[PDB]
């Protein structure tokens, strides 16, 4: 066996002389020290996560039962919320309070922006997201429908310049809103020049300023024919770029070159639910990658991480400004257990507590010098958590940390947590959770997909719930998001801590995304997630648009949403479809989870583009996942549909996913040879019996399994 022996462990020898000859270096953590801590943190909290994940089965089973045993459709909201209460699921609302974390970056706790989540095994991606602190809105404009493609003003092999011209008009009018001047439009400029430390620009009969002339924040070259000029809005950074003997700049009336924005303010490198990793192999290539972020010397080809960059103040000075996005990681939760340790019984360890191990080592590397910059300033270490349940599940989440903090010799309360919202036991608890890590939280986040699969598998047996599409509408989401950021507001969160929104999925509705994410700031979240350094930008629009700061205040001391509409279930109705909207639903759950599975067990791929019915391109994850199994599920489990209905609809979309993919293995005609195929029918029949709906353990397992035939 290639394991190592620590204590109880047997560790995978990758995984060993990676943090040996990798992680250890350069932190000043004794080696012999640090294997005994992750022995004795290992040994000391594995049963309360054991115990945390058997309150969970124990209290779904008391509520399938609560359901079995009830007639009445109209189900009595006073019982059932009497009921949650007496078995502990709903709990006593603590007295109000606020948060007292401390040492947290600006980026965090003031700058409201997009918040950009990559997965974390593929460096490249991750390089380019780290990067996406800045970004090109001329590019993004460009390259997407935002400008939609009309006559003439399509996208071609070459520059198109009814197009292009339309892009620029586009930025003129965001910098007419977002930084007005004096009087006239930046679409009548001519020149921009510094003068006694003021911007002005040339209009053709007269020149003008800024109506508010704090919001220029600098210029690079000579005050005079300045190479680029920088503004502030909302606490975010445009550079307007200029130069007349480029390509577009040729082509403009101030010899404009492209309008960069800050975009990403923040980004969430991701060991969870968009990669795939079952082994110590796989965990080693993220952790690396991880290492190579926070030590600065990641590259990919050679794409590297971005230096910080250079300005004149406008007196004329020089400052810098952060290149790189600010870094978070997503660990995984408390549920699944990974065979990279196993203890001496062949039991594998708890990969929660792996992961908050060996990321919280590696992000100390962060923390210093990068042979320049740093992630943290101010000394945190920003880790997401999630798939929690409930405020005791935050307490163990602190816990460890604790532990790990005084493994690592880490300052107490160094690594922070990012809350996600995502579980309706943490809803309905909120205040609660929040309380539980008030010296540690950093956000709370509407994990809005998770929260669906929850939200299905909770009620599984009270009936068949609302299609897919449908749930982002219904009562108890509206309530949900709305008392996240109550919850939130009412914690202290504004100027200390983010509120943060889901993830937009639909990567190639650029147009949609403008027109519609605005919500998200308008209902006070100081960040929201985006798929792509493309999105983070067009998003960042919003929060030139949005006051985030302003909404916020005018939230503060508001209810908007009750814990009946919190636990309002999403049943459908009565003869609510049609057979051709009931098959146009399987078909399209059917082709999601075999699009998003394919490609999971056959490459470790945990995060794909897939086309739905209606061909609109949606990045999934197991999130997503998630809810299509779930509910599925929650069809066959209520005779909305047969057995056969699913097996033919999984055989129907499956060689429609083979065209679609290439070091590819197709899984028609023979299915059931198919150990991806297998995966996508065992996550819907068993479904209802995986534990809140995960689909961790099915994927793990059958990737392996894949692996292992692969092998031979
Ligand atoms: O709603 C939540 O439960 C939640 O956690 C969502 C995600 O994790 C998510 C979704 C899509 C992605 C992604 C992450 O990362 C890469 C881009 O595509
Ligand atoms: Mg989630």
């Excluded at 002339?213 to 200029?242: K, R």
């Excluded at 991480?305 to 408390?334: E, I, K, W």
């Excluded at 539980?436 to 939200?455: C, H, K, M, Q, S």
């Excluded at 908007?560 to 009565?574: D, F, G, M, S, V």
């Amino acid at each position: 066996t290639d394991r190592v022996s620590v204590g109880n462990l047997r560790i995978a020898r990758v995984l060993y002389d990676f943090v040996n000859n990798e992680a250890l270096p350069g932190t000043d953590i004794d080696p012999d020290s640090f294997w005994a801590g992750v022995d004795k943190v290992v040994a000391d909290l594995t049963p309360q996560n054991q115990a945390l994940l058997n309150a969970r089965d124990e209290l779904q089973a008391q509520i399938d039962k609560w359901h079995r045993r009830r007639v009445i459709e109209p189900i009595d909201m006073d019982a059932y919320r009497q009921f949650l209460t007496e078995i502990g699921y709903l709990l006593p609302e603590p007295d109000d309070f606020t948060i007292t974390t401390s040492g947290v970056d600006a980026e965090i706790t003031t700058t409201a922006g997009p918040q950009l989540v990559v997965p974390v095994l593929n460096a490249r991606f991750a390089l380019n997201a780290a990067n996406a602190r800045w970004g090109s809105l001329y590019d993004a404009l460009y390259g997407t429908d935002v400008i939609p493609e009309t006559d003439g003003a399509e996208k071609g092999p070459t520059y198109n310049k009814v197009r292009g011209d339309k892009v620029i008009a586009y930025a003129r009018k965001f910098l007419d809103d977002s930084v007005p001047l004096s009087s006239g439009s930046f679409g009548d400029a001519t020149g921009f020049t510094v003068q006694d430390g003021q911007l002005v620009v040339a209009l053709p009969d007269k020149s003008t300023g800024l109506a508010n002339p704090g919001q220029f924040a600098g210029y690079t070259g000579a005050a005079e024919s300045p190479t680029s000029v920088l503004l502030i809005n909302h606490g975010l950074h445009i550079e307007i770029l200029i130069d007349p003997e480029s390509q577009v700049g040729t082509t403009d009336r101030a010899g404009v070159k492209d309008v960069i924005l800050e975009s990403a303010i923040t980004t969430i490198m991701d060991f969870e639910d968009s990669v795939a990793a079952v082994d110590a192999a796989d965990k080693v290539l993220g952790y690396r990658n991880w290492l190579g972020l926070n030590k600065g010397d990641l590259a990919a080809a050679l794409r590297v991480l971005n230096r910080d960059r250079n300005y004149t103040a406008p007196g004329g000075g020089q400052f810098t400004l952060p290149g790189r996005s600010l870094m978070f990681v997503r660990n995984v939760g408390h549920l699944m257990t990974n065979d990279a340790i196993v203890d001496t019984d062949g039991s594998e360890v708890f990969e929660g507590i792996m992961d908050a191990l060996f990321t919280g080592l590696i992000a100390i590397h962060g923390l210093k010098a990068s042979d320049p910059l740093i992630n943290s300033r101010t000394g945190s270490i920003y880790i997401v958590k999630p798939k929690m349940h409930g405020p005791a599940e935050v307490a163990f989440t602190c816990e460890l940390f604790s532990r790990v903090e005084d493994v690592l010799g880490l300052p107490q309360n160094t690594m922070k947590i990012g809350i996600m919202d995502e579980e309706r036991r943490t809803t309905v608890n909120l205040k609660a959770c929040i309380k539980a890590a008030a010296d540690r939280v950093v956000f709370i986040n509407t994990g809005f997909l998770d929260r669906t699969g929850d939200e299905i598998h909770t009620s599984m047996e009270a009936g068949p719930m609302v299609r897919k599409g449908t749930m982002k509408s219904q009562p108890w989401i509206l309530a949900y998001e709305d008392h996240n950021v109550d919850a939130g507001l009412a914690a202290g969160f504004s100027g200390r801590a983010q509120v943060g929104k889901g993830m937009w999925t639909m990567t190639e509705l650029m147009a949609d995304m403008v027109e519609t994410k605005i919500a998200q700031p308008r209902a006070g979240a100081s960040t929201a997630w985006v798929p792509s350094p493309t999105a983070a930008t067009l998003h960042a629009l919003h929060y030139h648009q949005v006051d985030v700061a302003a909404v916020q205040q005018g939230l503060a001391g508001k209810r908007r949403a009750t814990i009946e509409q919190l636990l309002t279930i999403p049943l459908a109705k009565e003869l609510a479809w049609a057979p051709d909207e009931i098959r146009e639903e399987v078909d399209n759950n059917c082709q999601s989870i075999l699009g998003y599975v394919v490609r999971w067990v056959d490459q470790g791929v945990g995060a794909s583009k897939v086309p739905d019915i209606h061909d609109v391109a949606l990045m999934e994850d197991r999130a997503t996942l998630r809810i299509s199994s779930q509910l599925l599920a929650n069809w066959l489990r209520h005779g909305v549909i047969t057995s056969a209905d699913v097996r033919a609809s999984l055989e129907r979309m499956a060689p429609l996913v083979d065209r679609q993919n290439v070091a590819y293995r197709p899984m028609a005609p023979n299915f059931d040879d198919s150990i991806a195929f297998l995966a996508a029918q065992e996550l819907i029949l068993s479904g209802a019996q995986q534990p809140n709906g995960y689909t961790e353990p099915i994927l793990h397992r059958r990737r392996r399994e894949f692996k292992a035939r692969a092998a031979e």
